[PDB]
Amino acid sequence: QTHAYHMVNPSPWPLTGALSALLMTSGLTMWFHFNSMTLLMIGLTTNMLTMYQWWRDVIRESTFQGHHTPAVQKGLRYGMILFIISEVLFFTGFFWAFYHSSLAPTPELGGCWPPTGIHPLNPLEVPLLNTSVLLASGVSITWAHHSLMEGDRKHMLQALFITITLGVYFTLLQASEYYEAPFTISDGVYGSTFFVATGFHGLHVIIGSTFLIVCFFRQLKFHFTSNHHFGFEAAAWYWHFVDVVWLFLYVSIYWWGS
């Protein structure tokens, strides 16, 4: 080749990923209808196996084999931005469901929002703490980024560790909230919108935290250079996306919808 692009070795992971999707969906069906978790647990296992080996191979190709030329890195930049945009539109559908329900509350609700019998969480208690936590993690991840560009191993690791710790604190605070909440997913459209929207957000926080932990261990193993660290940038963009989705949830569901 006298181009800069990456011709990827033939790989089984697309097929194992596709089969993991079949096992997870057929597994959910077998859990909801046929009282069994077997297929679902095989599909969750094969999904984690697939993602581990696929992203391992991407590390091998880049850090160890040198395939990420500037042109390849630029492609991955576009790919992550476009992925985040698809994730924004996914959340938009849940925001649309929330505003649809809350702006025109039906007679079954008492014709009011929040519905009759719903006692919202106080948005100035743990929801406000969660907001300070994710905003603070946006500052610390930015400190990590700058440390890395400036060649500062120790301060990159400290900043990234602080960012992960905040992600975990949010997740434990939200788990605790969920358990103390006097309303459930089954408490009509108020519970439906609250738990499905904040639930998908919580999944994204765990995904994002997991990505940051991957970056933390790669940094510990000296994989990042001061100039080449796209996995760190991608995880930072993803992390900022998770913060911004939280801010929209906080204003919409917790504050305006209370």
């Binding site: 009759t116 208690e125 703490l129 300070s132 400190w143 909440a181």
Partner: protein, 72 residues
């Protein structure tokens, strides 16, 4: 630079978290649970849940989450 973002982390961001943590831990006491009313728009059961006895939500809290028939 890194110096500025570290200054913001320790000088503003973590102090905010410390203060919201204090604010939260001062309002952390258990609220008195409201009288049970079997409202038809709440405690929805169109299909049994796929776990436990089919009638308990996933993060069911006996103290604050009544069943369709009331507090356990």
């Amino acid at each position: 630079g890194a110096r500025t973002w570290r200054f913001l982390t320790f000088g503003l961001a973590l102090p905010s978290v410390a203060l919201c943590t204090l604010n939260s831990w001062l309002h952390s006491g258990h609220r008195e649970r409201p009288a049970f009313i079997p409202y038809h728009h709440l405690r929805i059961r169109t299909k049994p849940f796929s776990w436990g006895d089919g009638n308990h939500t996933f993060f069911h809290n006996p103290r604050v989450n009544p069943l369709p028939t009331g507090y356990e």
